[PDB]
Amino acid sequence: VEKVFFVTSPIYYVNAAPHIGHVYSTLITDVIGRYHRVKGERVFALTGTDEHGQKVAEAAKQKQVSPYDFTTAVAGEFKKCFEQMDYSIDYFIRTTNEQHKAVVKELWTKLEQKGDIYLGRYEGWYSISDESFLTPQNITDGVDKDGNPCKVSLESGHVVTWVSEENYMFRLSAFRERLLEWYHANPGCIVPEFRRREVIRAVEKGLPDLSVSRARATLHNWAIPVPGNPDHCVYVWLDALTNYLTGSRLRVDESGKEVSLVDDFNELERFPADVHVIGKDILKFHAIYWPAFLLSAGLPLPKKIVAHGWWTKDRKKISKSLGNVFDPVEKAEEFGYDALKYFLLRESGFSDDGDYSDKNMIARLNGELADTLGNLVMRCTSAKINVNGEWPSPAAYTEEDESLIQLIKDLPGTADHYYLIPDIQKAIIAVFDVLRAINAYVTDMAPWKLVKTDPERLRTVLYITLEGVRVTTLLLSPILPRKSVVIFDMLGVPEVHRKGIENFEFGAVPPGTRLGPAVEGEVLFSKRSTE
Numbered sequence: 001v002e003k004v005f006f007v008t009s010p011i012y013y014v015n016a017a018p019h020i021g022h023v024y025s026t027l028i029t030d031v032i033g034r035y036h037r038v039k040g041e042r043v044f045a046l047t048g049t050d051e052h053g054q055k056v057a058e059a060a061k062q063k064q065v066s067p068y069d070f071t072t073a074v075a076g077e078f079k080k081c082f083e084q085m086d087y088s089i090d091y092f093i094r095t096t097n098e099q100h101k102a103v104v105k106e107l108w109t110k111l112e113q114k115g116d117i118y119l120g121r122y123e124g125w126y127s128i129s130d131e132s133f134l135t136p137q138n139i140t141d142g143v144d145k146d147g148n149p150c151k152v153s154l155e156s157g158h159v160v161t162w163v164s165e166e167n168y169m170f171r172l173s174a175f176r177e178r179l180l181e182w183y184h185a186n187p188g189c190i191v192p193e194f195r196r197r198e199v200i201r202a203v204e205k206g207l208p209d210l211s212v213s214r215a216r217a218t219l220h221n222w223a224i225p226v227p228g229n230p231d232h233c234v235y236v237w238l239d240a241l242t243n244y245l246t247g248s249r250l251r252v253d254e255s256g257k258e259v260s261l262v263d264d265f266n267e268l269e270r271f272p273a274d275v276h277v278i279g280k281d282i283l284k285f286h287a288i289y290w291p292a293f294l295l296s297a298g299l300p301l302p303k304k305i306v307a308h309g310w311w312t313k314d315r316k317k318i319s320k321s322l323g324n325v326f327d328p329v330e331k332a333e334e335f336g337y338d339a340l341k342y343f344l345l346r347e348s349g350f351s352d353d354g355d356y357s358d359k360n361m362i363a364r365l366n367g368e369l370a371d372t373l374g375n376l377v378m379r380c381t382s383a384k385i386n387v388n389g390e391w392p393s394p395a396a397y398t399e400e401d402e403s404l405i406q407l408i409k410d411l412p413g414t415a416d417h418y419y420l421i422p423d424i425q426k427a428i429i430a431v432f433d434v435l436r437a438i439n440a441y442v443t444d445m446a447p448w449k450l451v452k453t454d455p456e457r458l459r460t461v462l463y464i465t466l467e468g469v470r471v472t473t474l475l476l477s478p479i480l481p482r483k484s485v486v487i488f489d490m491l492g493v494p495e496v497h498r499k500g501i502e503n504f505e506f507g508a509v510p511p512g513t514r515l516g517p518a519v520e521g522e523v524l525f526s527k528r529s530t531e
C-alpha cells in the first residue's frame with residue numbers, strides 16, 4: 001500500500017501555556033515525519049489543540065474571559081511556540097474548527113446507526129483535569145487546593161468528583177474480543193512493549209461501557225452538541241480523538257490554512273495513522289477507546305501507537321509553583337535548537353522518564369556533538385588535511401579501510417529499522433557508534449602526517465572519512481535539520497544527494513566534488529563552559 005505516511009501528535013488542552021511535554025511530543029512527531037520525507041515518501045504530520053470541555057472552560061472562567069477568546073489566545077501561544085521550535089508540521093488543527101465539528105457529528109451518527117450508542121447512566125468518579133472516568137480502585141485520599149480532605153486520581157493526583165448523570169453510552173464492553181484479536185495480530189502496534197502488555201492485561205480483565213455525552217450545563221455549553229439531542233454534548237475525548245480523522249480529510253493551502261473537507265478519507269490517502277505519538281498518560285484513550293470507535297464505525301485502525309514518558313528537571317518535578325521551570329525555547333536560545341532536540345531525543349528512551357540538567361546537557365553537547373561530530377567534520381574539510389578542498393579519488397582499500405566501510409554500509413538498514421519501531425534513541429546511538437569508529441580510524445591513520453608522507457594513502461583515508469560523515473549526517477538530518485545542512489554545505493554535497501534512499505548508499509557523491517567555501521571563525525558546535 002503506497003500511501004501518505006501519516007504521523008500525529010496528541011492535540012493539547014489549552015488550559016495553560018505550552019511547556020516541555022507538548023514540545024517533546026510534537027518533536028517526536030516531527031522527527032518521524034522528517035525521516036520519512038528524507039526517504040522520499042509523502043508525509044502528513046499533524047499536531048494541534050484540544051479546546052473544548054469543562055477543564056478548558058473552567059480555566060477560561062478563572063481568567064474571567066470568554067472561552068472563544070481564551071482558546072484562541074492560548075492556541076496562538078502553541079502555534080508561536082512550535083514555529084519558534086522550527087518544526088516541519090503540515091497542519092495545526094483546532095477542535096473549535098467548523099469542519100472538525102462536522103466530522104465528529106458524522107462519526108457519532110455512524111456509531112449510533114451501528115447500534116453501539118444507547119441512553120444510559122454514569123454514576124462514578126471523574127477527573128475533570130484528565131477528563132477521565134475512574135473506578136474506585138483508581139482513586140485514593142488526598143488534599144485539595146484549600147488543604148481539605150478529598151479524593152484524587154491514583155494515576156494523576158488531580159482532584160476527582162462524583163458524577164451521576166443520564167449520559168449516552170458507547171458499548172465498549174462489546175469490543176473486548178475484537179480488541180484482543182487486534183493486539184495479538186499486530187504485536188508491534190503499541191510501543192514500547194511493556195505498555196502493550198499493560199493494555200492487553202487491562203482489556204483482558206473486562207471493559208465497562210463508556211459515557212460519550214454529558215449534560216450540557218456541566219460543560220458550561222463549551223462542547224459539540226450531540227446530533228439529535230441538544231441537551232447533551234459530545235464527550236471531549238470522542239471529540240478530541242476524531243481530530244486524527246478530520247486532519248486526514250483536510251486539504252491545506254500553502255499558508256497552512258485549511259481550505260476544504262473531503263467526504264471520504266481515501267481521497268487524501270492519509271487515514272489511518274501510521275504512527276500516533278502520545279504520552280503514557282493518554283494510552284487508554286488511544287489503545288482502547290479509539291480503536292473501539294473505529295471498529296464500530298468500520299474505519300481502519302492505526303498501525304502504531306508510541307507512548308513516551310514524562311520529563312523531570314534535576315531529578316525533581318517540573319513546576320512553576322514549585323520553582324523548577326524548564327523552558328525549552330529558553331534552553332534552545334542558550335544551547336542551540338538542534339542541540340536541545342538532540343539532547344531530548346538522545347537522553348531518554350520512550351520506556352523512560354527522562355531527566356534534564358544543564359550539566360548533562362553540556363556533557364552531551366561537548367562530548368557527542370562537538371568532540372565527536374563537529375571535530376570530525378572539521379578534520380575532513382580542513383585545508384591543512386584536505387589540501388585540494390575536494391572529495392578525493394580513493395586508492396586501494398586495506399582491511400581496516402574495509403571494516404569501516406562495512407560499518408557505514410550497514411548503518412542505513414540499522415537506523416531505518418530503529419526509526420520504524422519507532423525508537424529514536426537507538427537510531428541516534430547507532431549513528432554515533434559509527435561516528436566514533438570513523439574518529440578512531442582517523443586517529444589511527446593520522447591523515448595530517450600523510451599529507452607529507454603518503455599523498456596516495458591520504459586520498460583513501462579522506463574519501464572514506466568524507467563519505468562516513470555524509471551518510472551519518474543524512475541519517476541524523478531528522479534530528480539536526482539545521483546543522484545537517486551546514487555540514488552538507490561544508491562537504492559540498494549537492495542538493496539532490498541530501499535525500500532519497502538512493503543516497504543511503506556508500507559512494508553516492510563522486511570523487512572530484514568540491515567542498516563548500518570556508519569561513520574564518522566558523523564552528524559547527526562550540527563547546528560550553530563546564531561548571
Ligand code: MET
Binds near residue numbers: 012243282
Ligand atoms: C486526541 S489527543 C488529546 C490529548 C489531551 N488534550 C491531553 O492534553 O492530554
